[PDB]
């Protein structure tokens, strides 16, 4: 009918087409606006009620967390979202909904470590693996949500005497991103990391020979399934509270977890759908099947601020 004002931290040079369907399905316009995460946050809270901002994407549960406590988002009831979206991956009051689920697993290097070596996250405190762990800084927050889901699973006191052990086995201090970790522990730098898997399914997709070689030698590890299940995190997008259109900003989050979107965002940017039943991308499926930690996301929000203190307290740079 009219259009959105999309505000997004996530830029993917796929996801002009994504939206281009959103266009030809509705007839509604899509104007984006990107930016940091915390510049976009900051940007709404000062523009007012006069922000023209009608739907925040961004990545992580720490971010959206964020944005939820600060009073950004309006609660949206919809048959469809909560239908396609499990609970566990949305804001229990319809606050906001992740619309892609990555997971945080262990990536191993294929020529030193057999996955019968390997357990739970837990198990990486352990000092057979002194000297044979990397990990990207504990800014990150993508490692905040981790250790929020231990402490929330195991308590602050187990989760903090993790952390030293885990701390204490790292092979060298943290650099680089996820995909760092990912290119020495190919090279034998390190033995084992810990990174998202939609990374590896960057390098094996690619066209080009020798980021495809780099992956060939890491292995990839869903932790915890005989337990609690491999913790997982989303990309998630929310109604602005002062949404000068509220209507077009529901049909989109409607649209982004149906079916074509949810199928596009597989294949394309090699995450797993929120949506059941979607095909995954070729080499993300064979990965293989695994169980998700069902715990409520929301529940990690309040764990963050114990996660980072324990994190400083174990010497995690």
Same mark, same amino acid.
Request: aromatic share 10%; proline share 5%; glycine share 8%.
């Given at each position: 009918?009219?259009?959105?004002?999309?505000?997004?931290?996530?830029?993917?040079?796929?996801?002009?087409?994504?939206?281009?369907?959103?266009?030809?399905?509705?007839?509604?316009?899509?104007?984006?606006?990107?930016?940091?995460?915390?510049?976009?946050?900051?940007?709404?809270?000062?523009?007012?009620?006069?922000?023209?901002?009608? %739907?925040?994407?961004? %990545?992580?549960?720490?971010?959206?967390?964020?944005?939820?406590?600060?009073?950004?988002? $309006?609660?949206?009831?919809?048959?469809?979202?909560?239908?396609?979206?499990?609970?566990?991956?949305?804001?229990?009051?319809?606050?906001?909904?992740?619309?892609?689920?990555?997971?945080?697993?262990?990536?191993?290097?294929?020529?030193?470590?057999?996955?019968?070596?390997?357990?739970?996250?837990?198990?990486?405190?352990?000092?057979?693996?002194?000297?044979?762990?990397?990990?990207?800084?504990?800014?990150?927050?993508?490692? $905040?949500?981790?250790?929020?889901?231990?402490?929330?699973?195991?308590?602050?006191?187990?989760?903090?005497?993790?952390?030293?052990?885990?701390?204490?086995?790292?092979?060298?201090?943290? @650099?680089?991103?996820?995909?760092?970790?990912?290119?020495?522990?190919?090279?034998?730098?390190?033995?084992?990391?810990?990174?998202?898997?939609?990374?590896?399914?960057?390098?094996?997709?690619?066209?080009?020979?020798?980021?495809?070689?780099?992956?060939?030698?890491?292995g990839v590890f869903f932790p915890? @399934?005989?337990?609690?299940?491999?913790?997982?995190?989303?990309?998630?997008?929310?109604?602005?509270?002062?949404?000068?259109?509220?209507?077009?900003?529901?049909?989109?989050?409607?649209?982004?977890?149906?079916?074509?979107?949810?199928?596009?965002?597989?294949?394309?940017?090699?995450?797993?759908?929120?949506?059941?039943?979607?095909?995954?991308?070729?080499?993300?499926?064979?990965?293989?099947?695994?169980?998700?930690?069902?715990?409520?996301?929301?529940?990690?929000g309040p764990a963050l601020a114990?996660?980072?203190?324990?994190?400083?307290?174990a010497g995690w740079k």
């Amino acid at each position: 009918q009219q259009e959105i004002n999309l505000y997004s931290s996530r830029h993917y040079n796929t996801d002009n087409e994504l939206y281009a369907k959103f266009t030809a399905e509705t007839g509604i316009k899509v104007n984006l606006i990107e930016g940091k995460a915390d510049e976009l946050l900051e940007r709404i809270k000062s523009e007012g009620a006069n922000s023209p901002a009608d %739907v925040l994407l961004t %990545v992580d549960l720490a971010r959206l967390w964020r944005a939820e406590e600060d009073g950004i988002f $309006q609660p949206v009831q919809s048959e469809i979202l909560e239908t396609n979206v499990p609970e566990y991956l949305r804001s229990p009051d319809g606050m906001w909904f992740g619309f892609t689920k990555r997971a945080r697993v262990i990536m191993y290097n294929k020529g030193k470590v057999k996955p019968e070596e390997l357990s739970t996250y837990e198990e990486l405190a352990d000092p057979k693996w002194k000297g044979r762990v990397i990990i990207r800084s504990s800014s990150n927050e993508y490692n $905040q949500s981790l250790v929020a889901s231990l402490v929330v699973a195991d308590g602050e006191e187990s989760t903090l005497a993790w952390a030293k052990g885990f701390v204490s086995n790292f092979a060298r201090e943290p @650099q680089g991103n996820d995909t760092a970790q990912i290119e020495a522990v190919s090279s034998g730098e390190a033995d084992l990391t810990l990174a998202n898997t939609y990374y590896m399914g960057r390098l094996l997709e690619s066209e080009d020979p020798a980021q495809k070689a780099i992956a060939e030698n890491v292995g990839v590890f869903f932790p915890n @399934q005989e337990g609690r299940g491999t913790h997982v995190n989303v990309s998630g997008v929310g109604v602005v509270k002062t949404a000068p259109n509220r209507e077009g900003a529901v049909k989109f989050i409607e649209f982004l977890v149906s079916e074509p979107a949810q199928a596009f965002l597989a294949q394309n940017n090699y995450e797993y759908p929120v949506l059941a039943g979607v095909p995954l991308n070729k080499s993300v499926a064979s990965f293989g099947e695994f169980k998700s930690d069902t715990t409520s996301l929301d529940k990690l929000g309040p764990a963050l601020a114990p996660a980072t203190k324990i994190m400083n307290e174990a010497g995690w740079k």
